[PDB]
Design a protein around this ligand. Structure first.
Ligand SMILES: *C/C=C(C)/C=C/C=C(C)/C=C/C1=C(C)CCCC1(C)C
Ligand SMILES: *C/C=C(C)/C=C/C=C(C)/C=C/C1=C(C)CCCC1(C)C
Ligand SMILES: *C/C=C(C)/C=C/C=C(C)/C=C/C1=C(C)CCCC1(C)C
Lengths: 224, 224, 224
């Protein structure tokens, strides 16, 4: 509803983000190869930070009251804090893996940058119609990322060790399906056009969350 | 006045930032040399981001009401968001071009960092007299950048290919004149001591804007 | 009390941060070795930025009124702005010195990132009990940094020139004692459980401040 009905999923989300955190920490202990160590460090802040956000979200600090088209709607801007950080870090996990030219890395981060950032302003507009105007400009941002990811990073990927190629594909396909889920979820949800209730919203991004970060966590890190 | 008289220039500014964006995007398509690709990626986020800011500025989100010395004055803090990002990216375009030692790059970004950042606090102070105290400290910041730019980057520049040297000078001279324009513009303007009206302010930074980013865009990117 | 009793220490803190700034600036003038230049640039933004924060803190902008457990308490969020920037830069001074693998650098910055960041949310919670919940999670963050600093960076350090080893130890030991002081100071202080008055708080972080940045300034920079 606005800080009480989904206290559950939230709690559930904190337990999951942080468990995943304690796990990695107690899994990179060994690590000799500095090369892989990178992946580790990265593939760990993500859950950690993710944990801090899902925690303030539960306790309260998370939400805020954005006024749009009639009544006062809930907006865990706390998410965006997270996504603003995680999402880049993730891309790097990808670029870094498939050794991408800094050129594309850079354009890729900034692409994501404008995406999430704008996703925030979207979920912070008072004028009801404008909310979607950013939704638009933002998606355009994502379709960009996914494009120059599923095209390039595929090629370069599939031009080295069989290890990389395959693994890349794993995450790559997941990332695409997973990620894409958002625009819609956001939409049907209370942050955009309120179709489903917050009882849902929370739980949707909740699953997409633990799966994208810890999914991409076990999946990635547990590969050569 | 405060969101209505300059709706024009604003609209005009959005059309220009974004047009420049679509242009680059459809101009880096080819690009084989990863070296130059860097320039591209960079020389593109700038307009893009620039576009997003000038857009929220028009629709509304842009402005805010800062209270100083009597009445309530307008402050498109939205600009600063932009400048906070563009300006560094630009410097990198410069440093990167004239292959500058990370040492100076770093000190240069942070120099700009303190500049824009402080330019914000300046344009956010309630006590009328203090506004200028930051104006001061801030300018000091710029004079720093321009100094260690027009001095160093000139030398190193003029010690390679005739291409670089000349091009550097192009942008370098523009950057200096252009950039400098601000301190004054800001001043005469409503964000500092209100001399000219917002009918102007907007339109001034508007021109200095499209010219600095897209100016530096065509100018730069269209060179070897 | 809340912007008047400690106007002193504050003023004193500004004078010190900025003096240290003018000093470095007029001490890196020479510098031929690009390698060391890095240290310089870094070891300078720190004081500079530090100066800007301690200045807005004195003039006013600094503080804010956070409501927790009864009455309205003061919170120079301005600090956190500072620490959020300085602290990383410092670590880099360390990592960079003892040539640490980017892997650890990265995990180290993000470690600090979550630390300060969370230290803020801590000092921004309304519910009195939660304030300490972040205090906890945050410290955990620091103990992390100090751990993987006093362990690793020691080893790698002590495996090169006698210069480095010794110097590292200097700063390293200082950093540890100094840094640690905070959690407690914060605690006994008004930002956490209000034991001592703001007459103190200010002056404590004031000393720990000028000593950590300018301490680590002269100490570091004045070594081979
Ligand atoms: C851990 C979090 C992850 C992997 C988040 C991914 C998020 C997105 C792809 C979000 C996309 C959005 C839009 C395309 C439109 C505006 C709203 C957003 C930010 C939810
Ligand atoms: C695309 C935007 C560009 C190139 C902006 C450049 C802006 C400046 C050089 C701004 C300077 C300012 C001061 C020197 C004093 C405080 C106010 C500012 C931020 C307008
Ligand atoms: C120039 C500033 C420096 C070196 C600051 C260092 C600050 C810390 C180690 C702060 C630590 C904190 C906690 C461990 C708990 C939450 C409160 C903080 C941010 C004061």
């Amino acid at each position: 509803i606005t800080g009480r009905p989904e206290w559950i999923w939230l709690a559930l989300g904190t337990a999951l983000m942080g468990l995943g955190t304690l796990y990695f920490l107690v899994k990179g202990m060994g690590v000799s190869d500095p090369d892989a160590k990178k992946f580790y460090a990265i593939t760990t802040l993500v859950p950690a930070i993710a944990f801090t956000m899902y925690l303030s979200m539960l306790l309260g600090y998370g939400l805020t009251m954005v006024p749009f088209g009639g009544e006062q709607n809930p907006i865990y801007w706390a998410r965006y804090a997270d996504w603003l950080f995680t999402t880049p870090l993730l891309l790097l996990d990808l670029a870094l893996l498939v050794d991408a030219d800094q050129g594309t890395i850079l354009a890729l981060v900034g692409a994501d940058g404008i995406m999430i950032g704008t996703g925030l302003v979207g979920a912070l507009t008072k004028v009801y119609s404008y909310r979607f105007v950013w939704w638009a400009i933002s998606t355009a941002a994502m379709l960009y990322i996914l494009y120059v990811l599923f095209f390039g990073f595929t090629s370069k990927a599939e031009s080295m060790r069989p290890e990389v190629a395959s693994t890349f594909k794993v995450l790559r396909n997941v990332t695409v399906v997973l990620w894409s889920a958002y625009p819609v979820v956001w939409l049907i949800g209370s942050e955009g056009a309120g179709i489903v209730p917050l009882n849902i919203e929370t739980l949707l991004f909740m699953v997409l969350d633990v799966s994208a970060k810890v999914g991409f966590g076990l999946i990635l890190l547990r590969s050569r």
